[PDB]
């Protein structure tokens, strides 16, 4: 029962090199190198599904801050104000409104100010 | 029931280990041998009883006894054996014929093991105190 490995091995290498498309040089041509590239790609990707949630929140905050300061209050007090007003709109939505409905954002600032006054 | 609808009892054909076939298997690389040293090597390992150099237990301790050539031609008979002989007479020959003692046995003892529920005539055999009580209770006879 002698077993030849070509068909199985070829499918295995091809499955990796296909995931390496777009990579530079040996990384998209040469199995040994492609394999290490695909692994590192998964590692980073795992890492960055966690990081992605960090970077976006960091973006929202920064924009809320800008829009808050435009209406004369700082991010930190604005958040405290809204918390004391039992407003529960989160930061993704608040950052959207900061950009697309400047009049509603101002109204949110007045609700924050009132709750702090 | 066809040659392609028969299968073995659950758990009766466990699969063999195959070392050295990668990370997923759990037995890759070192193959469960750990790292380095004598035991990791092909053909590596120490002999039975070896303890590292210390005088081992089977040399530490002293020899005792001798072997009795007589014990080996001496057999014990159970009460449960007495009915298994054709003729209700138990001798060395009878017991040999019924395959109860070895062909070269020259002495035998009936002991209190199992039971006897039929009258038997034991003869040319030693009989234990208990066995004599049991053999006689069932109507049997002992004689030299």
């Amino acid at each position: 029962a002698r077993v030849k490995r070509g068909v199985i091995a070829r499918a295995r290498h091809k499955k990796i090199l296909k995931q390496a498309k777009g990579y530079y040089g040996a990384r998209s041509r040469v199995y040994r190198v492609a394999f290490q590239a695909v692994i590192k790609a998964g590692q980073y990707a795992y890492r960055d599904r966690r990081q992605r949630k960090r970077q976006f929140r960091q973006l929202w905050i920064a924009r809320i801050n800008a829009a808050a300061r435009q209406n004369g209050i700082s991010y930190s007090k604005f958040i405290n104000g809204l918390k004391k007003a039992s407003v529960e709109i989160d930061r993704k939505i608040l950052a959207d409104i900061a950009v697309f409905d400047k009049v509603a954002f101002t109204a949110l600032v007045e609700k924050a100010k009132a709750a702090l006054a | 029931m066809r040659l392609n609808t028969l299968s073995p009892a659950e758990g009766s054909k466990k699969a063999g280990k195959r070392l050295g076939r990668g990370i997923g298997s759990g037995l890759g690389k070192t193959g469960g041998r750990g790292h380095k040293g004598q035991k990791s090597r092909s053909g590596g390992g120490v002999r039975r009883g070896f303890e590292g150099g210390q005088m081992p237990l089977y040399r530490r301790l002293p020899k005792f006894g001798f072997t009795s050539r007589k014990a080996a031609i001496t057999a014990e008979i159970r009460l449960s054996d007495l009915a298994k002989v054709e003729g209700g007479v138990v001798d060395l020959n009878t017991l040999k014929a019924a395959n109860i003692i070895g062909i070269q046995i020259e002495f035998a003892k009936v002991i209190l093991a199992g039971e006897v529920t039929t009258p038997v005539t034991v003869r040319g055999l030693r009989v234990t105190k208990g066995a004599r009580a049991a053999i006689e209770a069932a109507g049997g006879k002992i004689e030299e």
């Binding site: - | 039975r48 009883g49 303890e51 081992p56 237990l57 089977y58 040399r59 530490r60 301790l61 002293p62 020899k63 005792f64 006894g65």
Partner: protein
């Protein structure tokens, strides 16, 4: 082929009814005058092989 008995083990251990091994005590061969009578008395009777050593003895006596 058949496993071979470590024959020197077979001259020092005997299997008992429940599967352990009996053996003779060390220290009662010579240099006896200095040894207390009490001490020597307690070395006369046979003793049982300890838990730590059964693996070793059993390995040496596959046909015990």
């Amino acid at each position: 082929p058949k496993i071979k008995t470590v024959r020197g083990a077979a001259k020092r251990f005997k299997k008992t009814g429940k599967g352990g091994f009996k053996h003779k005590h060390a220290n009662l061969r010579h240099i006896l005058t200095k040894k207390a009578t009490k001490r020597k008395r307690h070395l006369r009777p046979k003793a049982m092989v300890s838990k730590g050593d059964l693996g070793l003895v059993i390995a040496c006596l596959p046909y015990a």
